[PDB]
Design a binder for this molecule. Structure first.
Ligand SMILES: CC(C)N1c2cccc(F)c2C[C@H]1c1cnc[nH]1
Length: 370
């Protein structure tokens, strides 16, 4: 009934509450690099702009509302509701492009990733997003009963121009990103699995020979693993004590395999598997902390999760809105749900942001207390 008028504005403030916290979190932090911050703050600035200037009207217009103090309100209301979503999609596209270029072009791109360069990128997103939003000689006096003239021709070019094409690209480059990351870690993950497999085989073994062969197996696996670069220690020197801690760790391990190999040949089947558990624990304490993903890999994956919500929130709306050109299915029950679903995308960006990024939780708890 009337309980819902406050809920939407309540969730509308959740964008201000959520995104402004991010706006100032990255605003001035020695940990936050300026290249990435610029993009996450203009994205959070579009969300904080649409939650205030466009969000509330959609609720009243949805129940007991019409354009007041002129249709000019219905002019800008349409124009910003496309602008933010065309710019938000295109921003996610550019971060998608930034993440790809950084992972591949390496030193050269870092030289060109000047904060001024990426500042220029954002303004251009606003520029080109304003072109897709501005209609040529076509308007989106008395009350007009605010909706969008569903010109089948224009609508789809804009429907694609706002959501489809930018989302398509950002999906298309991130699938290349995933394949690259999977290729790097592949061989090492072979080894780590082979270690774990032979370990369980050791604990799940009944005779000494089975253990001895399992042990000899992992011995090569560890040596093969010893020559990889673990994910955290990517682009670090072998002068870095972390990269050396990795190596010493597999020396220490190999030795323990050999010592456990002496027990299996001595005929002490039980002592062997016992000592094999000691191998496992040692491996975890030495190695596990380096299998964790690098600092740049976290940012790329976390924005992979963000594209997951831009697709999940907006695709139902745009796909049902695109189908209206052929008018196949029920809009009455679905339009309302999908119009909100796409809209909550702006409030839920800092939600996934702190839910996954380790720097986010601390930046959220330290922004408030100061
Ligand atoms: C105004 C409606 C039709 N919308 C629109 C129009 C053009 C581009 C575009 F990306 C969007 C999103 C969608 C919408 C805005 N607010 C909630 N849903």
């Amino acid at each position: 009934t009337l309980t819902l008028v406050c809920l939407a504005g309540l969730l509308m403030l959740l964008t201000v509450f959520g995104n402004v916290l991010v706006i100032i979190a990255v605003f001035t932090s020695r940990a936050l690099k300026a290249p990435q911050n610029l993009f996450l703050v203009s994205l959070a600035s579009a969300d904080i702009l649409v939650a205030t200037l466009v969000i509330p009207f959609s609720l009243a217009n949805e129940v007991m509302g019409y354009w007041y103090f002129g249709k000019a309100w219905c002019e800008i209301y349409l124009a910003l509701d496309v602008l933010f979503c065309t710019s938000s999609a295109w921003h996610l596209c550019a971060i998608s492009l930034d993440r790809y270029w950084s992972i591949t072009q390496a030193i050269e791109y870092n030289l060109k990733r000047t904060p001024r360069r990426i500042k220029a990128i954002i303004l251009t997103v606003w520029v080109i997003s304003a072109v897709i939003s501005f209609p040529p000689l076509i308007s989106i006096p008395a009350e007009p009963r605010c909706e969008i003239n569903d010109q089948k021709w224009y609508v789809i070019s804009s429907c694609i121009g706002s959501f489809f094409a930018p989302c398509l690209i950002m999906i298309l480059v991130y699938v290349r990103i995933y394949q690259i990351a999977k290729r790097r870690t592949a061989d090492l993950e072979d080894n780590w699995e082979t270690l774990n497999d032979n370990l369980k085989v050791i604990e799940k073994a009944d005779n000494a020979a089975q253990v001895k062969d399992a042990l000899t197996k992992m011995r090569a696996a560890a040596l093969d693993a010893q020559k990889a670069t673990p994910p955290k220690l990517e682009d670090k020197s072998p002068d870095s004590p972390e990269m050396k801690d990795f190596r010493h760790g597999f020396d220490i391990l190999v030795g323990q395999i050999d010592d456990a190999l002496k027990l299996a040949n001595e005929g002490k089947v039980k002592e062997a598997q016992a000592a094999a558990e000691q191998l496992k624990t040692t491996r975890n304490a030495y190695i596990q902390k380096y299998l964790r993903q690098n600092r740049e890999k976290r940012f790329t994956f976390v924005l992979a999760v963000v594209i997951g919500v831009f697709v999940v929130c907006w695709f139902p709306f745009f796909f049902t809105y695109t189908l209206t050109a052929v008018g196949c299915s029920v809009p009455r029950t679905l339009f309302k749900f999908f119009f909100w679903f796409g809209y909550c995308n702006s409030s839920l960006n800092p939600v996934i942001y702190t839910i996954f990024n380790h720097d986010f939780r601390r930046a959220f708890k330290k922004i408030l207390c100061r």
